[PDB]
Design an enzyme around this catalytic site. Structure first.
Site, PDB file in Angstrom:
ATOM      1  N   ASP A 165       6.482   2.207  18.615  1.00  0.00           N
ATOM      2  CA  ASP A 165       6.212   3.196  17.578  1.00  0.00           C
ATOM      3  C   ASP A 165       7.517   3.697  16.978  1.00  0.00           C
ATOM      4  OD1 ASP A 165       5.166   5.098  15.950  1.00  0.00           O
ATOM      5  OD2 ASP A 165       4.670   6.517  17.589  1.00  0.00           O
ATOM      6  N   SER A 202      11.757   4.089  -1.309  1.00  0.00           N
ATOM      7  CA  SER A 202      11.364   2.914  -2.062  1.00  0.00           C
ATOM      8  C   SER A 202      11.647   3.141  -3.544  1.00  0.00           C
ATOM      9  CB  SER A 202       9.872   2.635  -1.843  1.00  0.00           C
ATOM     10  OG  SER A 202       9.386   1.621  -2.710  1.00  0.00           O
TER      11      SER A 202
HETATM   12  N1  LIG Z   1       3.149   6.714  14.669  1.00  0.00           N
HETATM   13  C1  LIG Z   1       1.885   7.052  14.820  1.00  0.00           C
HETATM   14  N2  LIG Z   1       1.033   7.381  13.780  1.00  0.00           N
HETATM   15  C2  LIG Z   1      -0.163   7.695  14.294  1.00  0.00           C
HETATM   16  O1  LIG Z   1      -1.177   8.035  13.670  1.00  0.00           O
HETATM   17  C3  LIG Z   1      -0.114   7.550  15.755  1.00  0.00           C
HETATM   18  C4  LIG Z   1      -1.108   7.745  16.698  1.00  0.00           C
HETATM   19  C5  LIG Z   1      -0.778   7.509  18.019  1.00  0.00           C
HETATM   20  C6  LIG Z   1       0.499   7.103  18.382  1.00  0.00           C
HETATM   21  C7  LIG Z   1       1.495   6.909  17.433  1.00  0.00           C
HETATM   22  C8  LIG Z   1       1.164   7.141  16.106  1.00  0.00           C
END
Ligand SMILES: NC1=NC(=O)c2ccccc21
Ligand SMILES: NC1=NC(=O)c2ccccc21
Length: 330
Positions: free
Chosen positions: A35, A199
């Protein structure tokens, strides 16, 4: 050093991607959601409330000879979708694709919200935003990438997400065989802790490119592409029958439609998202209304270049002293 690991969609819609991660000694392999929009490495564990675990693989620190409880440390995080988790902290050895970090903070979940419990395919998160967003208290901890940086051949990682197919996260090197043409680099602001960039504009299908600055974040942990309402309206206006549905929570379109592509600008370069990447399928099983992959950011407060956008590109996360982002077609 370097590392290279395959990342795999969790389902037929590419709702998220999981990458195997080795934790502890002997290794315990968990499938984590990498993430770039957060900075905590947390896992389902032997300490997670039993009623909140449903099929995930758990980390058991008591079975790891290299695990050490980080005395007094706790963590608690909430994400843009309203989900959340919290718990305690161990340090342990963590390896990704052959790259090893000793003393990595591994955040053990005591509690997780319903959407984590309900997703049996994701065993935790591996955050790759800037360590200033890490939630461990009272001593903030570094991300896996930040800890690895000193040892990496180059202080970079790359995301090469697949469309309905596996892809790759590489650490420490840029695979020049994985993209076409040239990588265009663009400036990053770290002020909010994200890989935040601007962007240079967009086009819908074969339409003319609109030059306009769009500030947003490169977020591998967000599924969709969230952009200003003006841009999103311009896109969906090209799809017969598409509309914004307050009851569903966004733009929907007839499942019989063929969607136009969407182009975004990176400096003078252009990344084309094929129309098929924007189809997220029926809103409910058997419905002929389909959910769109480009949605308005108006209620978020930030534009988000999530997986829909990133999987159209080979993306370089350059963690040099002055970070930058690079995008190439592939
Ligand atoms: N970067 C993220 N956007 C999300 O909506 C999300 C949900 C759960 C973990 C990580 C994330
Ligand atoms: C809680 N916080 C802790 O530090 C801990 C250790 C072992 C089991 C459960 C818990």
């Amino acid at each position: 050093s370097t590392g290279s690991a395959t990342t795999t969609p969790i389902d037929s819609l590419d709702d998220a991607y999981i990458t195997p991660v080795q934790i502890g000694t002997p290794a315990q392999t968990l499938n984590l959601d990498f993430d770039t929009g957060s900075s905590d490495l947390w896992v389902f564990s032997s300490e997670t409330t039993a009623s909140e675990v449903d099929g995930q693989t758990i980390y058991t620190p008591s079975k790891s000879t290299t695990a050490k409880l980080l005395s007094g440390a706790t963590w608690s995080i909430s994400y843009g979708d309203g989900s959340s988790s919290s718990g305690d902290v161990y340090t342990d050895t963590v390896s990704v694709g052959g790259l090893t970090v000793t003393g990595q903070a591994v955040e053990s979940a005591k509690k997780v919200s319903s959407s984590f419990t309900e997703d049996s395919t994701i065993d935790g998160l591996l955050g790759l935003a800037f360590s200033t967003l890490n939630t461990v208290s009272p001593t903030q901890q570094k991300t896996f990438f930040d800890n690895a940086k000193a040892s990496l051949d180059s202080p970079v990682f790359t995301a090469d997400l697949g469309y309905h197919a596996p892809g790759t996260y590489n650490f420490g090197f840029i695979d020049t065989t994985a993209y076409t043409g040239s990588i265009t680099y663009t400036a990053v602001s770290t002020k909010q802790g994200f890989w935040e960039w601007t962007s240079t504009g967009y086009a819908v299908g074969s339409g003319t490119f609109k030059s306009t600055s769009i500030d947003g974040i490169a977020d591998t942990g967000t599924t969709l592409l969230y952009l200003p309402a003006t841009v999103v309206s311009a896109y969906w206006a090209q799809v017969s029958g598409a509309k914004s549905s307050s009851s569903v929570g966004g733009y929907v379109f007839p499942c019989s439609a063929t969607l136009p592509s969407f182009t975004f600008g990176v400096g003078s370069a252009r990344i084309v998202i094929p129309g098929d990447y924007i189809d997220f399928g029926p809103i409910s099983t058997g419905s002929s209304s389909c959910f769109g992959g480009i949605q308005s950011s108006a209620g978020i407060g930030i534009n988000i270049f999530g997986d829909v956008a990133l999987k159209a590109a080979f993306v370089v996360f350059n963690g040099a002293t002055t970070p930058t982002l690079g995008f190439a077609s592939k």
